[PDB]
Design a protein around this ligand. Structure first.
Ligand SMILES: [Zn+2]
Lengths: 98, 209, 704, 62, 636
RNA sequence: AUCGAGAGGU
DNA sequence: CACTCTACCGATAAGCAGACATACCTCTCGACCCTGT
């Protein structure tokens, strides 16, 4: 979250919403100073966030690897449930569908 | 292979599968129910009932072949947690209605031991089942060996060869599937024959105890 | 003269010796002998040798063969008829020659001799054949020189090129999964077989080392060239840091090139010099072997004690049925198979078998765990698992885990079955809000109405899953459920949290000027109760929680499960049909697992799984999806299915670890498991249940 | 010299035996003692450093 | 049957308003010993050419100290699981732990953020309160003293908020003496109050190495920046196993400690007794000598030395009877090291210092280890180097909290920030150059950690070290016989410790070095010296299996019968066994050639001919000529 | 005679 | 015919301490403290 300090005493600024002026202000609890910079009092936090399937018969370029990740998904170009084969990229990086 | 996921309520498919498995269980029980009723499919049940299930239509009945008072039934009365008073009321309804009173009373959810104490208040046996324990039938499994039960005139001819009582015979507990799916009172050996192709003639006459 | 027939493997325990096999091989290599040599060997025989094989030739006169020597070593009259050798009164007709079939042939010969005449004849035959063979070799001599361990620099460069080719997949082994590890093991086995074929060209190594045994091949290749892999991630005995932040730094300090994939791809051998890093890795592997071996000797001892404290009273009576000493209980009706085949086994009426089955089950385990074999480790572990199952158990990992088969496509289109396999996961995964979040913002809005809160949660574009603004829908239903529940105490401000709503209009971007990202897909969940910022802050920390965690239901998922992965398996292990396949197709079988929702009574691990998947008719109801456990088939099917699933798994594990067949002992043990009303293991609580159900009054056993 | 990480090579070990007069690979012809006849397989013979353990047989027997 | 002991007498001076305190056992060949005395008095006075020293005779039994390995106490130990940084130290009072945590004692539930608190004198004090108490003035200043540079936005804004809330708890943490008093109240209201003014405790038990409080604060900064940087993932938690984080304590600290325990018992008795006399004689009557003497002995005999940390428990595995079966069993019994308890396995820091191949097999596998051949443990350097360090540019850490620390890198000696330096690379170089011109202690280790911007110099006791050849001097000094000292001094060799090594690029051998001279800074003397005394002599040791060479270097080497003793009349051991005609091996390992000792190999050369002999030699049986065993071989 | 500990071949 | 209010059985975790080092067998090397008549 945003961090601010009292200009006068270098202290933590506490957010305070003024109901009279209908604006957000930041005032230090310890002493006596207040102001507004961007009105963006945030509780910002980074909420923290797999290969289950595998193929055994997909054709490869030359060696017949038969390794790929198959799963049903929807493409951004054509809507609908369609098998999306994540190829092992033997000679092409584009993922091919059935 | 666009999966035609059933937009209908899962409760409808659940009730259909449960009733189908119950009707097949009663067919195995040796009761006379019209095979046309058992032949009802999911699409027919959906056409008749719709996609929203109704807990009002639950009547199932059956009859015995050579007996005079043996007629067991199924009522899917349970859809939420109930009390002993609900079972008592349905039992009083079927008591003032007719004499077929003995029936299965399946429950959609967990059962209470107070109900297990209360079944003794009724002068007959019942079978508390689940609405999920009748979603996949048994005896139609490629790993279940066919179970045959003998009558008390040729089973009684086990003291002739083995000369052994049922206590020393290999036991089976009255809580497994094929013991709570046919109906087995103590005093009849289940002459299990292993139809598993890898298993040889390992008949054990595993009786209930 | 009575313990020749083994009650463990079924064959003669008098197996072949090293010197005996070596002498027999070096004697069969030279079919014809001289005169003085032939006469000197027969001396150790039993009877004379009137007729010679080769009467007259160009330069040789009377010349005998090893076949007549074996004949005079054979008993007087015998008729084997084993489809490869014929004998009629100490007259051998034909004797095939192979690489290792001679041992099996002579084993069949001695078994036929034992079953025909008796044990004394076999003892005399062995006592007449051993010194003869010892003398035969002694004249010839056998030794190994340095030429036998020839490197063959051309083949060495070939092996080095093969190593360079095979080191490419080393980068993607410890990162993706264990299937690549098994493929790596297969490739290493193939390269080892190639090196063994390139190594067995000598005369002494081929005659002194077995060929069909994998352990001999490993111990021969590891000491001549291409030392095997010695650093793996499957062993829990050592810490993962030793291979995560030690070996890479060692290779970077000591080696010039990066070579990050140099963990078990060491090029040195035992015949050549070994690098210090290679010696360090080898010492680490040796220490791991030693600790595993010590545990392997320590714990199976306790296991044998536990399984022996209970199998000491199972003895057959005169009636032929298996009886118990306490309460005169019956376990089995007859010990011995009653199939179409018939054999007069050594098992009699007054003979104990429970102790015999105990020892015959404790023996295979010992071997599997004394050796450090990782292939046998999995096999040993499954056996250990079946030996520890208990009548009372709570939320074990095995019970919740359930296999999930499918139905073959009627159309038969390529990948149609696979299409179904990927699809079913999508109804059993548990995607949650958390996975999809990437940031978290809170802005102040200018101004009765008073709502200054716009989370802009900012989920990533994972539209592959496809979740709709229908996220809003699960959030709305969850907050409605939370607000409707008034029986809970000290609940959040649900009356003010009803104002949460998602709106993606491509214009909500109000992030800080730093970064210049300008992303999309916001989230406008806001709840207001007052104007002071402190109440806004504390409220935010509480409700934040429900969303990224609780909103599992939002996308592609059911709760009450963790995930679903597809695993290929051999169908011949679970079912035996007349039109079975080669068990090599890329068929994928799912493995659901249940998420602490197995808290349900006994096991509803099934009851929970059949319920979620109710919107997929591809699931087959014959050849059922069986839970990978022992106690759950007791509730799904009858006791017969549990008996079958136990005996099949024990037989498979025994065949994987050993070669002797013990089907009768496995059946006896599985029946001993089914006595107290429920499938119970061999432990303290199991022994208490056995003593309470069968009324066993034996304080001495529990005191020991 | 046979220091542990700088051992003499196999090519060197064997081109020494050759110069000595014995067979390059370390094996020698042996004639059987009891009969006098040459024996078919050359045997490997050389000088090794052995050790005796303190665990003698006599104490064990009881 | 008596203890070779030595009497210890101190000058006491009891005044009311040179006694004998005990007897320490002496170690054969130690300075105290009369056998070290002067030149060899008489070979004939019993000595065996083979014997070297290192043992104590306690009651007619020789006994030896297996060294014990303990954790370094001169560095900060970050632990990942509870997210704690620590300044462990021996005096219990001194330990200070700053530990992040979701505190549910007074704070909110898991929905809240974690907060940083300290643990000093069994108290729970917030961090920002403390900073203020030690003289930080404003919140900005403090932030500078914990200069997380990295912006891991999530962690910083949590720590800040939680810290500020635990501070408001105290009425005026920011201004006045209220923060200090808050602390005072807390320390005093604990179970066993120190009873010393806060202000003396802040100087006395909080960071005794530093002098001023302000300075003490800057250090609380380094201490937090680490817990923080770790959480963010830049730096890694410490491995208990790696040697760089361990110290080996030999026979000095172990003797110091047991006497300290005992001296105490005596002082306690003396006082109690003196009271009786004082209430209502020669000093000797009062102080009992027996106390130290009897006590030390009971330890040596029953082998139960005191626990290093717990104060009323006895560790076992510190003394062990020397084994005299062969000459080598003795040598490998005096070089063993132990770790009381991934520790059972080799590690890559055990390189050059402990042997990777040999270890006991049994319960102690891995835990007891054997030193390498060329490894020397260090001893406390009495000289103090701070002044010298200042001579090479190093500037004092400024007392004021206000100052920027623009680009200096911290220099820390044995764990105390003592200075700030500018261009670390240059500083380290000069310092090293001095070490090699013999103007600074030889065993000092200078490590420049580029990542954390610090130079850490250590000069404590217990650090395993080994020698290693250096390149440029090798190029022009050797060329233009050598005793070791001359070599060390003129800098053509040097002792480089485990941490410093990590920086070094050392070539494996002379040949390798010759191929590419520029890229390598040091060259190892010989790869054979990486093994123990009982393993560096085995021919083709890298040509056999690990288990086989382990067995041969652990049990077959000890049980081998040969060469027992030069004077055999002065010794009356229970079993001894001597070869009639012992022999040396034909092959020469370098190690035996250098050591120039012959008791290393115990056996005879036997002409073997692998072959099968009438099946008496199957399955590991041995068949032998009956006429070489009668013409004398293997007779004992 | 007894106890405990340590070091061992399996 | 709806309401509230506390006595009673569950299920719960939830906390609390322990409990454990396969087995046959060999050898050597030390073993309680304070006080009164
Ligand atoms: Zn201020």
């Amino acid at each position: 979250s945003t961090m601010k300090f009292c200009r006068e005493c270098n202290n933590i600024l506490y957010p305070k919403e003024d109901k009279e002026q209908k604006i957000l202000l930041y005032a230090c609890r310890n002493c006596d100073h207040q102001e507004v910079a961007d009105n963006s009092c945030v509780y910002r936090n980074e909420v923290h966030h797999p290969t289950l399937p595998r193929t055994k018969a997909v054709r490869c370029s030359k060696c017949q690897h038969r390794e790929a990740v198959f799963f049903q998904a929807t493409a951004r170009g054509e809507e609908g449930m369609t098998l999306f084969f994540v190829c092992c990229n033997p000679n092409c990086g584009h993922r091919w569908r059935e | 292979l666009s999966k035609y996921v059933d937009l209908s309520s899962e409760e409808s498919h659940r009730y259909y599968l449960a009733r189908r498995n119950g009707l097949q269980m009663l067919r195995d029980r040796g009761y006379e129910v019209s095979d046309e009723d058992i032949n009802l499919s999911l699409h027919d049940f959906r056409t008749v009932y719709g996609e929203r299930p109704d807990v009002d239509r639950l009547r199932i009945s059956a009859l015995h072949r050579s007996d005079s008072t043996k007629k067991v039934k199924i009522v899917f009365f349970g859809t939420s947690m109930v009390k002993v008073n609900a079972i008592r009321s349905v039992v009083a309804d079927i008591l003032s209605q007719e004499t077929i009173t003995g029936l299965i009373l399946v429950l959609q959810n967990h059962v209470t031991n107070q109900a297990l104490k209360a079944i003794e208040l009724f002068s007959f046996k019942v079978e508390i089942f689940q609405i999920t324990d009748l979603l996949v039938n048994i005896t139609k499994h490629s790993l279940k060996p066919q179970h045959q039960v003998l009558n008390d005139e040729e089973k009684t001819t086990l003291l002739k060869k083995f000369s052994i009582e049922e206590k020393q015979l290999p036991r089976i507990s009255k809580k497994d599937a094929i013991v709570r799916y046919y109906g087995l009172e103590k005093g009849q050996v289940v002459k299990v024959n292993y139809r598993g192709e890898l298993t040889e003639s390992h008949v054990a006459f595993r009786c209930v105890w | 003269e009575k313990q020749l027939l083994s009650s463990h493997t079924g064959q003669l325990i008098l197996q072949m010796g090293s010197d005996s096999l070596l002498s027999l091989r070096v004697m069969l290599e030279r079919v014809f002998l001289d005169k003085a040599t032939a006469q000197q060997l027969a001396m150790y025989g039993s009877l004379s040798l009137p007729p010679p094989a080769l009467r007259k030739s160009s330069k040789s006169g009377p010349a005998w063969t090893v076949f007549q020597i074996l004949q005079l070593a054979f008993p007087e009259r015998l008729s084997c008829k084993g489809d490869r050798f014929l004998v009629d009164g100490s007259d051998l007709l034909k004797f095939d020659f192979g690489v290792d079939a001679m041992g099996s042939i002579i084993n069949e010969i001695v078994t036929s001799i034992f079953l025909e005449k008796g044990p004394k004849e076999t003892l005399g035959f062995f006592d007449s054949l051993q010194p003869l063979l010892m003398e035969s070799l002694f004249a010839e001599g056998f030794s190994l020189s340095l030429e036998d361990l020839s490197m063959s620099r051309a083949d060495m460069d070939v092996i080095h090129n093969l190593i360079i080719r095979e080191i490419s997949p080393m980068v993607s082994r410890l990162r993706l999964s264990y299937r690549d590890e098994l493929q790596l093991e297969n490739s290493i086995h193939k390269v080892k077989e190639v090196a063994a074929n390139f190594m067995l060209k000598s005369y002494s190594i081929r005659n002194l080392i077995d060929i069909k045994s994998n352990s001999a091949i490993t111990k021969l290749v590891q000491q001549t060239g291409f030392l095997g892999l010695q650093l793996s991630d499957k062993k829990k005995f050592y810490t993962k840091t030793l291979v995560e932040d030690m070996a890479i730094f060692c290779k970077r300090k000591y080696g010039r090139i990066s070579s990050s994939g140099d963990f078990g791809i060491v090029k040195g051998c035992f015949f050549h010099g070994l690098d210090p890093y290679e010696e360090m890795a080898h010492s680490i592997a040796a220490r791991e072997v030693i600790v595993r071996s010590s545990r392997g000797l320590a714990e199976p001892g306790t296991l044998f004690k536990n399984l022996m404290a209970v199998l000491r009273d199972i003895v057959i009576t005169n009636d032929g049925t298996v009886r118990n000493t306490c309460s005169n209980s019956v376990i089995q009706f007859k010990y011995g198979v009653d199939s179409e085949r018939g054999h007069q086994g050594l098992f009699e009426a007054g003979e104990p078998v429970g102790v015999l089955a105990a020892t015959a089950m404790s023996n295979p385990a010992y071997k599997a765990v004394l050796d450090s074999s990782p292939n046998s480790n999995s096999s040993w572990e499954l056996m250990k698992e079946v030996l520890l199952c208990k009548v009372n158990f709570q939320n074990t990992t095995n019970d919740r885990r359930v296999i999930l088969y499918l139905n073959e496509c009627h159309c038969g289109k390529r990948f149609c079955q696979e299409n179904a396999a990927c699809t079913v996961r999508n109804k059993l995964n548990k995607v949650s809000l958390k996975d999809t979040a990437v940031e978290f913002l809170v802005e102040y809005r200018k101004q009765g109405i008073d709502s200054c809160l716009h989370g802009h949660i900012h989920l990533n574009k994972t539209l592959l899953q496809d979740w709709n603004i229908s996220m809003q829908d699960i959030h709305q239903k969850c907050e409605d459920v939370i607000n409707s529940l008034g029986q809970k105490k000290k609940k959040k401000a649900t009356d003010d949290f009803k104002r949460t709503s998602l709106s993606v209009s491509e214009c909500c971007s109000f992030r800080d000027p730093c970064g210049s990202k300008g992303s999309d897909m916001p989230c406008l969940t806001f709840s207001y109760n007052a104007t002071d910022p402190d109440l806004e802050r504390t409220l935010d920390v509480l409700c934040n929680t429900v969303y990224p965690v609780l909103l599992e239901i939002v996308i592609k998922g059911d709760s009450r499960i963790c995930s679903a992965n597809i695993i290929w398996n051999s169908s011949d292990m679970t079912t035996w049909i007349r039109n079975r396949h080669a068990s090599r197709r890329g068929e994928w079988v799912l493995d659901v697992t249940v998420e602490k929702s197995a808290v349900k009574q006994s096991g509803d691990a099934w009851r929970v799984v059949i319920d979620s998947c109710l919107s997929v008719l591809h699931l087959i109801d014959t050849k059922r999806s069986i839970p990978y456990s022992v106690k759950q088939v007791q509730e799904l099917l009858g006791l017969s299915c549990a008996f079958e699933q136990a005996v099949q798994r024990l037989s498979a594990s025994v065949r994987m670890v050993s070669k002797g067949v013990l089907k009768e002992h496995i059946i006896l043990l599985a029946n001993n498991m089914t006595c107290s009303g429920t499938m119970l293991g061999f432990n303290s609580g199991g022994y208490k249940a056995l003593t309470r159900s069968l009324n066993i009054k034996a304080p001495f056993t529990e005191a020991t | 010299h046979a220091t542990p990480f700088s051992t003499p090579g196999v090519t060197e070990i064997t081109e020494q035996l050759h110069r000595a007069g014995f067979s390059r690979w370390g094996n020698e012809r042996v004639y059987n003692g009891r009969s006098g006849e040459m024996m078919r397989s050359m045997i490997f013979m050389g000088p090794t450093f052995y050790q005796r353990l303190v665990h003698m047989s006599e104490d064990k027997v009881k | 049957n008596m203890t070779y002991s030595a009497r210890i007498k101190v000058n006491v001076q009891v005044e009311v308003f040179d006694i004998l305190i005990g007897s320490i056992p002496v170690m054969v060949k130690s300075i105290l010993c009369k056998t070290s005395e002067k030149g060899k008095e008489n070979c004939k006075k019993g000595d065996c050419a083979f014997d070297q020293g290192g043992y104590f005779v306690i009651k007619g039994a020789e006994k030896v100290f297996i060294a014990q390995e303990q954790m370094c106490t001169k560095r900060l130990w970050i632990s990942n699981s509870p997210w704690t940084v620590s300044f462990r130290s021996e005096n219990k009072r001194n330990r200070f732990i700053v530990r992040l945590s979701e505190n549910e004692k007074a704070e909110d539930y898991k929905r809240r953020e974690k907060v940083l608190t300290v643990y000093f004198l069994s108290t729970e004090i917030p961090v920002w309160l403390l900073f203020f108490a030690l003289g930080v003035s404003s919140d900005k200043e403090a932030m500078d003293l914990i200069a997380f540079d990295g912006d891991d936005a999530s962690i910083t804004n949590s720590l800040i908020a939680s810290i500020h809330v635990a501070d408001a708890v105290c009425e005026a943490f920011r201004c006045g003496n209220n923060a200090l008093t808050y602390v005072e109240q807390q320390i005093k209201s604990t179970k066993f109050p120190p009873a010393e003014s806060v202000d003396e405790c802040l100087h006395l038990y909080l960071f005794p190495g530093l002098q001023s409080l302000k300075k003490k604060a800057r250090f609380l900064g380094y201490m937090v920046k680490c817990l923080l940087n770790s959480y963010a993932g830049k730096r890694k938690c410490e491995n208990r196993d790696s040697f760089r984080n361990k110290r080996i304590e030999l026979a000095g600290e172990l003797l110091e400690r047991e006497i300290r325990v005992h001296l105490a018992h005596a002082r306690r008795k003396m006082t109690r007794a003196m009271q009786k006399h004082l209430s209502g004689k020669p000093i000797e009557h009062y102080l009992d000598a027996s106390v130290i003497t009897n006590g030390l002995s009971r330890a040596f005999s029953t082998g139960a030395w005191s626990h290093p940390f717990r104060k009323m428990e006895r560790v076992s595995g510190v003394v062990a009877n020397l084994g005299r079966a062969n000459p080598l069993q003795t040598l490998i019994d005096l070089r063993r090291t132990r770790q009381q308890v991934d520790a059972r396995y080799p590690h890559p820091s055990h390189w050059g210092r402990v042997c990777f191949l040999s270890t006991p097999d049994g319960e102690n596998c891995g835990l007891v280890k054997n030193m390498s051949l060329l490894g020397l443990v260090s001893t406390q350097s009495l000289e103090s180097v701070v002044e010298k360090l200042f001579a090479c540019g190093m500037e004092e850490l400024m007392d004021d909290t206000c100052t920027p620390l623009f680009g200096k890198h911290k220099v820390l000696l044995n764990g105390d920030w003592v200075g700030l330096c500018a261009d670390s690379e240059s500083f380290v170089a000069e310092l090293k150059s001095r070490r090699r011109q013999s103007e600074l202690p030889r065993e000092m280790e200078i490590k420049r950690d580029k990542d954390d911007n610090e130079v850490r110099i250590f000069t404590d006791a217990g650090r395993l070290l080994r020698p290693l050849l250096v390149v440029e001097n090798l190029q022009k000094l050797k060329q233009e016989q050598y005793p070791f000292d001359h070599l060390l001094d003129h800098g053509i060799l040097e002792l480089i410790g485990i941490e410093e090594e990590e920086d070094c690029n050392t070539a494996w051998g002379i040949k390798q070095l010759l191929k590419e001279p520029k890229i390598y800074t040091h060259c190892e003397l010989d790869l054979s010296f990486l093994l123990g005394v009982s393993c560096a002599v085995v021919p083709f040791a890298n040509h056999d299996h690990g288990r086989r060479v382990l067995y041969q270097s652990q049990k077959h080497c000890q049980q081998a019968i040969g060469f027992s003793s030069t004077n055999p009349n002065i010794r009356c051991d229970t079993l001894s066994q001597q070869l009639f005609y012992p022999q040396k091996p034909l092959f020469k390992t370098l190690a035996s050639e250098c050591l120039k000792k012959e008791v290393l190999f115990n056996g005879q050369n036997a002409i073997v001919a692998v072959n099968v002999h009438l099946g008496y030699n199957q399955e590991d049986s041995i068949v032998m000529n009956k006429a070489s065993l009668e013409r004398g071989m293997f007779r004992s």
